[PDB]
Amino acid sequence: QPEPDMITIFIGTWNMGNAPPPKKITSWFLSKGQGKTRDDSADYIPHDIYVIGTQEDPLSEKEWLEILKHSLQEITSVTFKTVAIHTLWNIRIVVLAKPEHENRISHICTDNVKTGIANTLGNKGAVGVSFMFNGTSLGFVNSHLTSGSEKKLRRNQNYMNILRFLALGDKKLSPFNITHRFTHLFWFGDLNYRVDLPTWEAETIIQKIKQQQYADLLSHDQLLTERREQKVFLHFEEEEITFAPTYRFERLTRDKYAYTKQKATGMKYNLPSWCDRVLWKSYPLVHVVCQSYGSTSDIMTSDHSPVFATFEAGVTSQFVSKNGPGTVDSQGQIEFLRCYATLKTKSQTKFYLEFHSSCLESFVKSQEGENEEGSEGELVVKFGETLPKLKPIISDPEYLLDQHILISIKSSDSDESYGEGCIALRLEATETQLPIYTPLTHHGELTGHFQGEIKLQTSQ
Numbered sequence: 311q312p313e314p315d316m317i318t319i320f321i322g323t324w325n326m327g328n329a330p331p332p333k334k335i336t337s338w339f340l341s342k343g344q345g346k347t348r349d350d351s352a353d354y355i356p357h358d359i360y361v362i363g364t365q366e367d368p369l370s371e372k373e374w375l376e377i378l379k380h381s382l383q384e385i386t387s388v389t390f391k392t393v394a395i396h397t398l399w400n401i402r403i404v405v406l407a408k409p410e411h412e413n414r415i416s417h418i419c420t421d422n423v424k425t426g427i428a429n430t431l432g433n434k435g436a437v438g439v440s441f442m443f444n445g446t447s448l449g450f451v452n453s454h455l456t457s458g459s460e461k462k463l464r465r466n467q468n469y470m471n472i473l474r475f476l477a478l479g480d481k482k483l484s485p486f487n488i489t490h491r492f493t494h495l496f497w498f499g500d501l502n503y504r505v506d507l508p509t510w511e512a513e514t515i516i517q518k519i520k521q522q523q524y525a526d527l528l529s530h531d532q533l534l535t536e537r538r539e540q541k542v543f544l545h546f547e548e549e550e551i552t553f554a555p556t557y558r559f560e561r562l563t564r565d566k567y568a569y570t571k572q573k574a575t576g577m578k579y580n581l582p583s584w585c586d587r588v589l590w591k592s593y594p595l596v597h598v599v600c601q602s603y604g605s606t607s608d609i610m611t612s613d614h615s616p617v618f619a620t621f622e623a624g625v626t627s628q629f630v631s632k633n634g635p636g637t638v639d640s641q642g643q644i645e646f647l648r649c650y651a652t653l654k655t656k657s658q659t660k661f662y663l664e665f666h667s668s669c670l671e672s673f674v675k676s677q678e679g680e681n682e683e684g685s686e687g688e689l690v691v692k693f694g695e696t697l698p699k700l701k702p703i704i705s706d707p708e709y710l711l712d713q714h715i716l717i718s719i720k721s722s723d724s725d726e727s728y729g730e731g732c733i734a735l736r737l738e739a740t741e742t743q744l745p746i747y748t749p750l751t752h753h754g755e756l757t758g759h760f761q762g763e764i765k766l767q768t769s770q
């Protein structure tokens with residue numbers, strides 16, 4: 311029975327509004343309703359992995375697991391295995407997988423982050439799950455961010471706290487936050503970004519939604535505009551939105567948006583918004599294709615509609631050779647030529663690099679680079695041909711060309727990372743000097759760039 315080189319992943323996010331679900335929620339897992347929906351001919355085909363994020367979830371873990379498993383069994387006739395479940399307050403993540411994957415999944419991690427301080431600590435934050443699927447690392451974050459149309463900067467701060475403090479994946483990747491630890495990272499939830507139009511325009515917005523004319527609303531969506539100004543979710547992807555705003559509905563219908571201020575809302579307006587979102591980030595040149603992104607029309611217990619997204623995701627096999635794992639394959643090498651980091655820092659410390667990769671026995675520290683002043687007032691750190699030759703554990707090109715090298719540039723004075731990035735080994739050629747590039751980030755914000763050339767030697 312062969313190992314897969316692709317799997318499909320379902321991501322669901324639903325803010326349940328503290329109400330139990332209706333008796334049937336199969337439309338959610340079938341990707342049926344509005345937006346980019348799944349073909350009817352696929353209805354019996356199970357996804358490999360289902361990841362369900364809830365917010366304002368009033369159920370126990372047992373109660374929700376029973377509903378989810380009974381829903382999937384009715385759709386697929388498969389009894390899914392529980393990989394992980396983790397709950398912070400009323401924010402929950404469930405990961406289910408086909409039973410045939412039980413011995414492909416390992417290194418399961420869960421964590422949460424509580425956002426805010428005093429007044430604003432106690433209900434918002436995030437839960438996460440990570441695991442290995444054969445040779446591929448997968449991370450999943452369900453966040454419930456700060457509410458309210460005039461709190462976009464608080465949401466952005468919540469995002470940065472969650473990616474800094476959520477402790478998932480390989481703890482040996484110490485310089486790297488969750489935005490670099492995984493082959494594929496999915497980040498979803500009630501992100502709570504709103505359509506930023508005047509209150510007076512509420513009925514005009516509703517009109518537009520009834521006409522399925524979303525363009526002048528999406529041009530005011532705070533998550534799209536904050537992402538375009540590089541204020542949040544830098545280097546993440548989102549599918550085009552082609553479904554109506556998923557908040558705020560009158561319960562028990564979808565015919566009415568309830569936007570007006572009420573004592574129950576703190577006298578705040580809730581103009582129709584795309585609160586409920588799925589975003590992803592995958593390593594460079596790894597296959598990831600969104601095959602659905604939409605909302606359900608028939609689940610009406612909450613003031614939010616459920617959102618679905620599904621993905622094709624490339625995966626790799628747990629590679630064994632005669633040599634690695636547990637020795638190097640001296641037929642393999644990675645050389646970095648003429649590399650330099652450009653940093654936005656005002657600091658004048660020396661810097662060194664660390665190279666991290668599951669193709670190495672352990673991470674590799676470089677010598678310090680040579681600092682020069684860039685013309686437009688920046689730091690350029692030159693490494694020359696000084697960088698250590700990296701010795702992968704396996705030289706087979708079928709393995710090595712699928713790997714990635716994480717890079718951290720660290721201060722000699724503090725050993726703190728000033729920037730992190732990732733280089734694919736999926737090269738156009740081996741034994742050939744080729745350009746490489748990554749942006750560098752720290753705490754998820756842009757701090758610089760790393761560029762140079764690579765020369766990869768494989769056994770072929």
Ligand SMILES: N#Cc1ccc(N2CCCOCC2)cn1
Nearest residue numbers: 417441442447448479480481482
């Ligand atoms: N994705 C992923 C992944 C890979 C390894 C891992 N562990 C072993 C090394 C120490 O890190 C924490 C536990 C955890 N998660």
